[PDB]
Design a protein around this ligand. Sequence first.
Ligand code: SRO
Ligand code: CA
Length: 223
Amino acid sequence: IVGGYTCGANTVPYQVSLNSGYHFCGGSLINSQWVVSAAHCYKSGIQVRLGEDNINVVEGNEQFISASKSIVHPSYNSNTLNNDIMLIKLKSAASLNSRVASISLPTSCASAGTQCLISGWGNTKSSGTSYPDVLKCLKAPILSDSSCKSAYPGQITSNMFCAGYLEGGKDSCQGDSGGPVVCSGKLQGIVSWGSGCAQKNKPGVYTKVCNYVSWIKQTIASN
Ligand SMILES: NCCc1c[nH]c2ccc(O)cc12
Ligand SMILES: [Ca+2]
């Protein structure tokens, strides 16, 4: 997260770190046994780390649970990033509490102008690299689809939205991939892609979660 702030330990209780020897992506806990992330975060050997603040220090609220199954969206295209969503099932149910809690799926899509919270352990620099240990947060509005399409000609599908600041300086970044965009207590977006981070006229692009709720629910119901 570039241009954000330190969230505060366990203040984003649905935020997970996906770990394969090291943090490599975010995700969102959506029930005791399932995480939603980006398809571009797919790999084998995932351990889901819940209850994290400092990802390099055991602070006492963590739950580490291996993935038993990953399901990349059937229509994910890794070249265009269309349908950039994946589900991860945990080998055992997480113990839900104030610091490890699921985030509600949307029943309605969100509109341009809605304020959201974006979070992760990604790079905090727009030029250069610095990776934080503690979770970072950014409040950002959803941008109009027309401004999103104008910012990224030929690239924005109906499964994507932009959020952030056209003036630059505030954005998600590398390592925030797969993490949440939460608006009014609902998971509306997943950190997906962009042209660099926090660049003028190049806001972050996010998977439009509301389009996937039916797929998520039916997938959970049979897996
Ligand atoms: N807005 C963050 C988009 C994003 C996701 N993964 C990334 C990796 C590198 C980068 O410059 C940007 C990204
Ligand atoms: Ca920790």
